[PDB]
Scaffold this motif. Structure first.
Motif, PDB file in Angstrom:
ATOM      1  N   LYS A 162       0.830  -1.202   0.000  1.00 32.09           N
ATOM      2  CA  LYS A 162       0.000   0.000   0.000  1.00 32.09           C
ATOM      3  C   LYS A 162       0.866   1.254   0.000  1.00 32.09           C
ATOM      4  O   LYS A 162       1.810   1.360   0.777  1.00 32.09           O
ATOM      5  CB  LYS A 162      -0.925  -0.052   1.228  1.00 32.09           C
ATOM      6  N   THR A 163       0.546   2.191  -0.891  1.00 30.75           N
ATOM      7  CA  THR A 163       1.300   3.430  -0.996  1.00 30.75           C
ATOM      8  C   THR A 163       0.640   4.547  -0.209  1.00 30.75           C
ATOM      9  O   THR A 163      -0.431   4.381   0.397  1.00 30.75           O
ATOM     10  CB  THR A 163       1.447   3.905  -2.478  1.00 30.75           C
ATOM     11  N   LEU A 164       1.287   5.706  -0.216  1.00 31.63           N
ATOM     12  CA  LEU A 164       0.733   6.834   0.510  1.00 31.63           C
ATOM     13  C   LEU A 164      -0.603   7.269  -0.085  1.00 31.63           C
ATOM     14  O   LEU A 164      -1.509   7.644   0.662  1.00 31.63           O
ATOM     15  CB  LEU A 164       1.739   7.984   0.546  1.00 31.63           C
ATOM     16  N   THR A 165      -0.737   7.179  -1.410  1.00 33.17           N
ATOM     17  CA  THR A 165      -1.989   7.557  -2.074  1.00 33.17           C
ATOM     18  C   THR A 165      -3.104   6.587  -1.688  1.00 33.17           C
ATOM     19  O   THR A 165      -4.279   6.828  -1.986  1.00 33.17           O
ATOM     20  CB  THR A 165      -1.870   7.545  -3.627  1.00 33.17           C
ATOM     21  N   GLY A 166      -2.742   5.493  -1.024  1.00 34.51           N
ATOM     22  CA  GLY A 166      -3.738   4.507  -0.637  1.00 34.51           C
ATOM     23  C   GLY A 166      -3.870   3.391  -1.664  1.00 34.51           C
ATOM     24  O   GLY A 166      -4.621   2.427  -1.449  1.00 34.51           O
ATOM     25  N   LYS A 167      -3.152   3.525  -2.778  1.00 34.38           N
ATOM     26  CA  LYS A 167      -3.178   2.525  -3.839  1.00 34.38           C
ATOM     27  C   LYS A 167      -2.653   1.221  -3.269  1.00 34.38           C
ATOM     28  O   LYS A 167      -1.666   1.231  -2.541  1.00 34.38           O
ATOM     29  CB  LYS A 167      -2.271   2.917  -4.992  1.00 34.38           C
ATOM     30  N   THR A 168      -3.309   0.118  -3.609  1.00 32.82           N
ATOM     31  CA  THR A 168      -2.885  -1.208  -3.150  1.00 32.82           C
ATOM     32  C   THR A 168      -2.405  -2.024  -4.342  1.00 32.82           C
ATOM     33  O   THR A 168      -3.131  -2.198  -5.326  1.00 32.82           O
ATOM     34  CB  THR A 168      -4.019  -1.975  -2.459  1.00 32.82           C
ATOM     35  N   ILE A 169      -1.168  -2.503  -4.239  1.00 32.11           N
ATOM     36  CA  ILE A 169      -0.496  -3.311  -5.267  1.00 32.11           C
ATOM     37  C   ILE A 169      -0.563  -4.765  -4.792  1.00 32.11           C
ATOM     38  O   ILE A 169      -0.323  -5.023  -3.611  1.00 32.11           O
ATOM     39  CB  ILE A 169       1.016  -2.931  -5.342  1.00 32.11           C
ATOM     40  N   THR A 170      -0.887  -5.701  -5.686  1.00 31.01           N
ATOM     41  CA  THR A 170      -0.913  -7.110  -5.327  1.00 31.01           C
ATOM     42  C   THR A 170       0.302  -7.790  -5.961  1.00 31.01           C
ATOM     43  O   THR A 170       0.580  -7.619  -7.163  1.00 31.01           O
ATOM     44  CB  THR A 170      -2.217  -7.808  -5.805  1.00 31.01           C
ATOM     45  N   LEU A 171       1.043  -8.552  -5.158  1.00 31.05           N
ATOM     46  CA  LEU A 171       2.227  -9.242  -5.661  1.00 31.05           C
ATOM     47  C   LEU A 171       2.166 -10.724  -5.400  1.00 31.05           C
ATOM     48  O   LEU A 171       1.592 -11.161  -4.413  1.00 31.05           O
ATOM     49  CB  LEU A 171       3.507  -8.723  -4.982  1.00 31.05           C
ATOM     50  N   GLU A 172       2.794 -11.469  -6.303  1.00 33.50           N
ATOM     51  CA  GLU A 172       2.932 -12.912  -6.218  1.00 33.50           C
ATOM     52  C   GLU A 172       4.377 -13.103  -5.778  1.00 33.50           C
ATOM     53  O   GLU A 172       5.296 -12.702  -6.502  1.00 33.50           O
ATOM     54  CB  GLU A 172       2.770 -13.549  -7.594  1.00 33.50           C
ATOM     55  N   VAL A 173       4.582 -13.690  -4.601  1.00 29.82           N
ATOM     56  CA  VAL A 173       5.931 -13.885  -4.087  1.00 29.82           C
ATOM     57  C   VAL A 173       6.082 -15.248  -3.411  1.00 29.82           C
ATOM     58  O   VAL A 173       5.105 -15.992  -3.266  1.00 29.82           O
ATOM     59  CB  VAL A 173       6.261 -12.810  -3.007  1.00 29.82           C
TER      60      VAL A 173
END
Length: 72
Positions: free
Chosen positions: A6-17
């Motif tokens: 999650k970034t400051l803008t509130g954007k949520t990134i989904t990652l495969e790890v």
């Protein structure tokens, strides 16, 4: 496994790890999806800045955790 960032803008990134992935590996994955170079990224979780060289498992970061991304 899947984790979120999650970034400051509130954007949520989904990652495969994988639990064995290092923090620098995760940062490259964020660059792959968002274009932000790893050197400009700071990832924080449980109040700790996650350091390169360590893995998600080292930090006991399990499935569906949400890391905090701050720019540097």
């Amino acid at each position: 496994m899947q984790i979120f960032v999650k970034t400051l803008t509130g954007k949520t990134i989904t990652l495969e790890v994988e639990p064995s992935d290092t923090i620098e590996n995760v940062k490259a994955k964020i660059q792959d999806k968002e274009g932000i170079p790893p050197d400009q990224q700071r990832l924080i979780f449980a109040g700790k800045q996650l350091e390169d060289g360590r893995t998600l498992s080292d930090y006991n970061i399990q499935k569906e955790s949400t890391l905090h991304l701050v720019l540097r």
